[PDB]
Every structure is written in C-alpha cells, then in structure tokens.
Design an enzyme around this catalytic site. Sequence first.
Site, PDB file in Angstrom:
ATOM      1  N   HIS A 132       1.860   2.302  -8.473  1.00 50.97           N
ATOM      2  CA  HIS A 132       0.662   2.010  -9.269  1.00 50.97           C
ATOM      3  C   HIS A 132       0.982   1.131 -10.478  1.00 50.97           C
ATOM      4  O   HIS A 132       0.083   0.551 -11.072  1.00 50.97           O
ATOM      5  CB  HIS A 132      -0.013   3.294  -9.774  1.00 50.97           C
ATOM      6  CG  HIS A 132      -0.652   4.112  -8.696  1.00 50.97           C
ATOM      7  ND1 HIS A 132      -1.584   3.591  -7.824  1.00 50.97           N
ATOM      8  CD2 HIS A 132      -0.498   5.415  -8.351  1.00 50.97           C
ATOM      9  CE1 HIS A 132      -1.983   4.541  -6.992  1.00 50.97           C
ATOM     10  NE2 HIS A 132      -1.336   5.655  -7.290  1.00 50.97           N
TER      11      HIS A 132
HETATM   12 ZN    ZN Z   1      -0.088   8.749  -4.263  1.00 46.12          ZN
END
Ligand code: ZN
Length: 355
Positions: A132
């Site tokens: 992320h």
């Molecule tokens: Zn994840």
Amino acid sequence: ITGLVYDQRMMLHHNMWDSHHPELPQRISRIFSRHEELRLLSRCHRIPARLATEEELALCHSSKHISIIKSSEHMKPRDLNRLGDEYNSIFISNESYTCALLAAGSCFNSAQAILTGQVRNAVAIVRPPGHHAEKDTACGFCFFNTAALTARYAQSITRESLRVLIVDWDVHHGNGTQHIFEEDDSVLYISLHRYEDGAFFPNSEDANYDKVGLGKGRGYNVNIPWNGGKMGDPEYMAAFHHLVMPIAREFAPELVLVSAGFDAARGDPLGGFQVTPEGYAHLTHQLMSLAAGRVLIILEGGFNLTSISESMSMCTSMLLGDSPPSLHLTPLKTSATVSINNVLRAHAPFWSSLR
Ligand SMILES: [Zn+2]
Ligand SMILES: *Nc1ccc2c(C)cc(=O)oc2c1
Ligand SMILES: [K+]
Ligand SMILES: [K+]
C-alpha cells in the site's frame, strides 16, 4: 534449495494505543514457529536480515517520505500519534522505521541469494507490510513498498530492464505497487483483490480491471477485481488458469516476486474470503514454473494467526519441492466469471495468449 529470512527484531514495531490491532508482532513469530514445527525451517538455507539503506529506499520513495518516516524514530508518543494520523490506516512506534528497513533489507538479501545462485527460491517472513506504500506516502499498515523496492533492487544488480513479475495475491489492491510501475514495461504487476466496486479498502477505482497501465507500461498492469462477496480456491485457481499464468508465460519474467498477503485466507477477519492453505500451495506451485523457478514469496497482509501460519508454510513446502496437496472443487460464483471475463476483454489487446 530454498532460502528463508526471518528476524524477530521486526516484532518491535507495535501499536502502543491498541495492542489488539490486527497487524500484530506475533504475525511473523507465529509463521516462523509453524515452519519450525513442520520441519520446513531445517530444510531451508537461512538468509540473514539486514537494514535497507536510504539510498535503496530512494529506488521507489521520495527523500521527503524517507525523511519523515525516519524522523519518527525520535518522536514522543504524542507526535507518533499525530504523524500516524496523517496517513490512511497507519500506526507508528519508535521502532517502526527500523522494522520497515529490516523488512526491505531482508527481501533484498533474499533476491540477491536467488540472483547469485545461492538459492533457487526463497520466502521472507517480514513485517510491517509494504504494497500500500506509495512513492511519497505511507498507507494501510505499510511504510515502504518492500516488493516494489525489491524489484528495483533486483534490476540494480542485474539489468535495468530485467523483467520482473509481481504477483500480488494479498486480498487488497497493491495501490502503491501499481502506481510505482504504472508506466513501466519491465515490471509486470498482476493483482487479485477484493474490490466491491470501490467499497473495499483502499477504496479507489485505480484497482478496477480497466486500469491496464500507461505509456510504455500499457498492458503491464493487470487488475483482477472481485465483486459480490466471498471467493475461494475455485475462483483463484480459475483466475490463475485463464489470466495470471497465460500472461506471465507470455511476459517470460526473469524473476517472480509474490506480494503474498494471506488475508484472502479462510478465517481472515479483514478479507472475508476462503482460500485454503492447499489453495495457496497450488498457486505457489504454478508460479514455480516461471523464471526458471526464481520465486521470492514476500509476506504482506494476513491477520488470522493460524491461517497465515498454515498458508505460508504450505507455500514454503511447495518451494522446497514437496508434492502439491490434493485439491478448484466447485463451479465459480457467477460474479467471478464476470470479473475474469472483464479482465480478459481489457487485456486481449495486449496479450496474444488471451485471444
Ligand atoms: Zn491486505
Ligand atoms: N482497517 C481495519 C482496522 C482494524 C480492524 C480490526 C481491529 C478488526 C477487523 O476485523 O478489521 C479491521 C480493519
Ligand atoms: K492483491
Ligand atoms: K507495470
């Protein structure tokens, strides 16, 4: 043979305000223990952890982002809280930066071990996770994009254009990995992820099947988004059969990195899916047919301690050359057929194997 890297120092990263936050220190110690219990540990070559250098972080991240996370090392609790709150879903302790460096450095050493021929393949039991993380920001429990950095690190000791496949089977979209390589044809990014038309974290349409890459990278970004609730082994095996493996074979990667979150696992409180340890074994075994077997499995998410321990151990068992367990048992959920067909339509212009 198979390499394994694990360092208990990566447990030091913790949430001082919520000790039950799902991204627990014992995620990696539980996985490590299960490898020991199943006698997988003793069959692996132990690769040492190391710190990533700031120069290495700069392969994918801005000096500003590096500096900010580095500064957290010296912050009092109040400022750690303030800094963490500047990001989407992040907690920070004084040890976080060091642990994120160790996670990245461990994977560099693992990629190095593979690329120098010391091992054929490897597994990295690391935290905090990475996919992320963006060039310029932290996100979703992630500080630096470990897998993305490892691809660049691999290129940095071989060839700038070394073809690297990243298969991201963490249940969430690796937004940071997609963006870092979106204009790049040297790194093929293939992600399977729960999407729910944007309702599932990280809640961006960037994760949809029609985002196929930009510029010279057009066609080298493959998103396989799931909609309409729980998916399992049948759907993941089908996506590998129809999409991941034909595209991967046509790309002919020289190195495979797996962003191996185990939050699509049966039992995961965040993912809500039901991929089994046997399912993960078969996914691993398929990827081993690529890149002359040069595969590095990197822990991302996955939050049911038993599920992730069983699932990642099964992956290492496959890497070590064990026979795949018996298994794909059911017709697909109809929305999964729609998803797969959507990706096929999106990527047929770019991959002859889909035509
Ligand atoms: Zn994840
Ligand atoms: N993003 C997020 C954060 C925290 C969570 C807990 C404590 C439990 C859960 O099931 O899902 C979460 C998701
Ligand atoms: K994913
Ligand atoms: K790409």
